[PDB]
Design a protein around this ligand. Structure first.
Ligand SMILES: O=C1c2ccccc2C(=O)c2c1cc(S(=O)(=O)O)c(O)c2O
Ligand SMILES: O=C1c2ccccc2C(=O)c2c1cc(S(=O)(=O)O)c(O)c2O
Ligand SMILES: O=C1c2ccccc2C(=O)c2c1cc(S(=O)(=O)O)c(O)c2O
Ligand SMILES: O=C1c2ccccc2C(=O)c2c1cc(S(=O)(=O)O)c(O)c2O
Ligand SMILES: [Mn+2]
Ligand SMILES: [Mn+2]
Ligand SMILES: [Mn+2]
Ligand SMILES: [Mn+2]
Lengths: 223, 222
């Protein structure tokens, strides 16, 4: 194990203004922190399909709307339900120093080591978050935090139980024969991700322990 | 009128170790922050019963489990699903200085003035929170924040339209449906949001009229 057993998994999702080529900015961020014990305690999935698992009782959750410096593209606004104008008239602040202080205090409540888990995190969420943080005067709150992409995890897990779509929704529906709730909201997508990670909790944890890498090594989306 | 128009409503709920006479400690806290515009934007309740309103798109949420210094009573544990032992084995921290910093930075993201809204807040949530904060070495993050009890609000609103004013009884009267996730902090906050969205304009006006400084709330115990 490269960095020992992860004590906390933080399921993470972002909404944003557009695609990577647009140099996008985060409009919404959700963190859901679960102790490894909470995950291993979800009862094994029986039935075909199994019921969507119960979320663990003990969770910490943070969900924030964030005013971007630039407009959301039409695609972003339509599917996320967020826009710059609406965020601003509801007094949302920018991704700023106070937000990093908030993230730091939130992370401090979680036992270490801690691992961020995000769907397609390696290509979107992690590089974008790094970019947002690098622009602040506050040091990164994620510097001692680990991270993993759940696409690769579910590829491994599904490979073993046994070409397929690994979109968040396709995975969820394949496992549970149910449409995801509140897709393209940060919180909604985090909850869907939690559910798919609860499918085979022990195997998911082991994969996470094996593949967790320092967030500090994630390259920014743009500079 | 007394402190102008509240720009943000923060719906709040707490779970705890027991009844007031037990000198209880918080085991769970949920804050849900909504701009007054988001509340005014929920479409008018039509039909009898009306559909449970849609939560606004734009919300900020914080939900935290907190290790108490003392054991939960048997009643608490059974109904809340939380205990000291389980909270501790999952590494939950106490209500401490870092928690206040977290609360402060969360509040700082909201336009002022800001008003806490809690069901029976005047008798339980507000005095307990005051007690928990007064224990800390960091000044209260709620010092410039206002607060109101949604029991009185819903009494007024429903009067204008003998009844139980338990959270679930109000919800069921309005929406003819049982609430979900009762006696979880977040579950109870969501239920409260739904009942406050019943008559958004009237609710806001009541809140504007009754908002009082949180700094004037007396601690549950010393
Ligand atoms: O592909 C994505 C995407 C992929 C993974 C995580 C997040 C996003 C995302 O947030 C996003 C995307 C596309 C658009 S687009 O079609 O309008 O240019 C958006 O506006 C937008 O916000
Ligand atoms: O492809 C998109 C997308 C495309 C067009 C407009 C909006 C989005 C979008 O909002 C989005 C997307 C993907 C993810 S995912 O791949 O990381 O599950 C998201 O979390 C997410 O919010
Ligand atoms: O009155 C409460 C109460 C009121 C408002 C918010 C939260 C609680 C609460 O959490 C609680 C209460 C009573 C008991 S008791 O009957 O077993 O002593 C509990 O165990 C317990 O957890
Ligand atoms: O009376 C209780 C109670 C009694 C015994 C065990 C547990 C609880 C409890 O958990 C609780 C209670 C009241 C409220 S309320 O009056 O503010 O809606 C709550 O929010 C809440 O969580
Ligand atoms: Mn995503
Ligand atoms: Mn998303
Ligand atoms: Mn309550
Ligand atoms: Mn409650």
């Amino acid at each position: 194990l490269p960095h020992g057993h992860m004590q906390t998994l933080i399921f993470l999702d972002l909404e944003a203004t557009g695609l990577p080529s647009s140099r996008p900015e985060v409009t919404e961020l959700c963190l859901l922190a679960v102790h490894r014990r909470a995950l291993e305690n979800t009862s094994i999935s029986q039935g075909h399909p199994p019921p969507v698992p119960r979320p663990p009782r003990v969770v910490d959750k943070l969900s924030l709307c964030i005013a971007p410096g630039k407009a959301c593209s039409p695609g972003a606004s339509e599917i996320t339900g967020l826009s710059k104008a609406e965020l601003e008239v509801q007094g949302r602040q920018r991704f700023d120093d106070n937000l990093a202080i908030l993230l730091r205090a939130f992370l401090q409540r979680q036992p270490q080591p801690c691992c961020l888990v995000a769907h397609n995190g390696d290509r979107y969420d992690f590089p974008l978050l790094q970019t947002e943080l690098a622009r602040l005067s506050t040091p990164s709150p994620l510097d001692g935090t680990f991270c993993v992409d759940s696409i690769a995890a579910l590829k491994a897990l599904e490979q073993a139980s046994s070409r397929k779509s690994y979109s968040l929704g396709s995975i969820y529906t394949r496992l549970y024969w149910q449409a995801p709730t509140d897709s393209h909201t940060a919180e909604g997508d985090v909850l869907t991700l939690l559910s798919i990670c609860q499918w085979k909790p022990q195997a998911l944890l082991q994969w996470v322990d094996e593949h967790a890498r320092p967030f500090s090594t994630v390259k920014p989306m743009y500079g």
